């Protein structure tokens, strides 16, 4: 379907968009006490894999799944909350602020770099077709 460069750069754009979405969702839920069921929000992470279609030669980036972080959930002593345990510590998400801003900046700069790569390739693509005519 897609040309190889198109597929690689578009996969890069989609992967960076997914990472930015995960960062934004984490930054929104930084102060959430409960979900829809009664469990604390867990910071999400996105794992980049190389989609090496040929044997070890090249390939874009794919995202296998969005994993839930395994870090000590923040404990805040609020015994009056219905979600407090026997000891009374309500669970707050493990979303760090600085890491998510850094992730947003890095995802934006990778997105823009891949956009520039596509823009650069495009002129050569259109100029290839003048070879025959």
């Amino acid at each position: 379907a897609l040309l190889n460069i198109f597929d690689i750069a578009g996969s890069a754009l989609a992967a960076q968009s997914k990472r930015l979405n995960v960062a934004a969702s984490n930054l929104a839920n930084a102060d959430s006490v409960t979900g829809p069921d009664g469990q604390p929000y867990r910071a999400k992470q996105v794992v980049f894999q190389v989609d090496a279609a040929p044997g070890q030669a090249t390939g874009g980036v794919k995202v296998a799944s969005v994993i839930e972080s395994q870090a000590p959930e923040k404990l805040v002593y609020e015994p009056g909350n219905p979600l407090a345990d026997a000891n009374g510590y309500v669970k707050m998400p493990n979303v760090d602020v600085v890491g998510e801003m850094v992730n947003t900046m890095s995802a934006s700069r990778s997105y823009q770099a891949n956009i520039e790569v596509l823009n650069t390739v495009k002129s050569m693509m259109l100029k290839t077709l003048t070879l025959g005519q």
């Binding site: 989609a14 829809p36 069921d37 009664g38 794919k62």
Partner: peptide, 21 residues
């Protein structure tokens, strides 16, 4: 399967409830 493939079936509706039903 892969995001961006072609299927003959529409995706299910995107519901996001606020409380558990």
């Amino acid at each position: 399967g892969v995001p961006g493939a072609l299927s003959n079936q529409p995706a299910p509706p995107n519901e996001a409830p606020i409380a558990t039903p």
